[PDB]
Design a protein around this ligand. Structure first.
Ligand SMILES: COc1ccc(S(=O)(=O)N(CC(N)=O)c2ccc(N(CC(N)=O)S(=O)(=O)c3ccc(NC(=O)CCN4CCC5(CCOC5)CC4)cc3)c3ccccc23)cc1
Length: 278
């Protein structure tokens, strides 16, 4: 019985930590973040949930939530504040990628070792990316889309840990900042985001076997700054801003039928959440 955890968000920055159970449709309210945050990222390592970066105002904080105790614990902060951050996990380490600090649009990347509570800088990305989506497939880390400070991006790049090097991959078919990015079945999905003119409902995926991006069925709601995760073989998108409204909608993508459906609503509409499953 794994749960979808949503941490933080915006409607000011929010402290909520809530867990959705897709099997019975219930939402459970859990211990608040010590410091409210939007534009943060969530991830899980060793069954512990981590909330990373965001804006409280730009945040360098890392905090760890233990589902077994229902408690948060502070961790070592990052080298720099990272609002609009993306995060990925490889080999039990958290990678914090991109984000912004005031006028700084980061290309820097750093890695956290939970066992010794230590961050270390690694190679910076080829492109500065705030509002970047991050996913990990076969122990490679992908940074997708974002905004470089001048141009909104359809480009994507891949980090090779054994070599501490970034390489551009095929660009998406759509410019997206603030997209939800995840991995399902050897494919990197990019859902929603902002193309510089509108929030998006389109969804595309990158097949590592073909090196090509292909559109799948669109979401019912346009959304940027959405939470996203995979649970029991399906993609879930949580909240976001549609250009007008802070959404409470949670949609769920079934890949076998290429269909989206509305499965629940968050307890209050919000954007800029961090999401993980454990
Ligand atoms: C004022 O309203 C909001 C919206 C979001 C949040 S927030 O909490 O989520 N947040 C705060 C933080 N700094 O922490 C983040 C902010 C930005 C983020 N993007 C920037 C990035 N990726 O670089 S974005 O998503 O691409 C984005 C980009 C542009 C907008 N412009 C508008 O909508 C203006 C409205 N106009 C109305 C008319 C239309 C035209 C057609 O119909 C709609 C177009 C749009 C919005 C989002 C966040 C990304 C990830 C995570 C968080 C992001 C708070 C308040």
């Amino acid at each position: 019985g794994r749960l979808i955890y949503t941490a933080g968000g915006y409607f000011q920055s929010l402290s909520y930590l809530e867990a959705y159970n897709p099997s019975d449709g219930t939402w459970l309210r859990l211990a608040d973040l010590q410091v409210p945050r939007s534009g943060l990222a969530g991830c899980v390592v060793g069954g512990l949930l981590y909330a990373v970066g965001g804006r409280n105002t730009d945040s360098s904080a890392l905090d760890c939530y233990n589902p077994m105790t229902n408690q948060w614990s502070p961790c070592a902060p990052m080298s720099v504040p990272r609002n609009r951050i993306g995060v990925g996990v490889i080999d039990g380490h958290i990678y914090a990628v991109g984000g912004s600090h005031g006028c700084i649009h980061h290309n820097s990347v750093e890695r956290y070792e939970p066992e010794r509570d230590e961050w270390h800088l690694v190679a910076p990305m080829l492109t500065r990316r705030i509002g970047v989506g991050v996913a990990v497939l076969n122990r490679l880390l992908y940074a997708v889309g974002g905004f470089d400070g001048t141009n909104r991006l359809n480009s994507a790049e891949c980090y090779y840990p054994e070599r501490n090097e970034w390489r551009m991959i095929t660009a998406m078919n759509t410019i997206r900042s603030g997209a939800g990015v995840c991995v399902l079945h050897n494919c990197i999905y990019a859902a929603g985001g902002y193309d510089g003119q509108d929030q998006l409902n389109s969804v595309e995926r990158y097949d590592v076997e073909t090196e090509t991006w292909t559109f799948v069925a669109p979401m019912k709601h346009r959304r940027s700054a959405l939470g996203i995760t995979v649970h029991q073989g399906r993609i879930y998108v949580l909240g976001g801003y549609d250009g007008h409204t802070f959404l409470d909608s949670v949609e769920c993508y079934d890949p076998d039928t290429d269909t989206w459906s509305e499965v629940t609503r968050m307890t209050s509409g919000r954007s800029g959440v961090g999401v993980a499953v454990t």
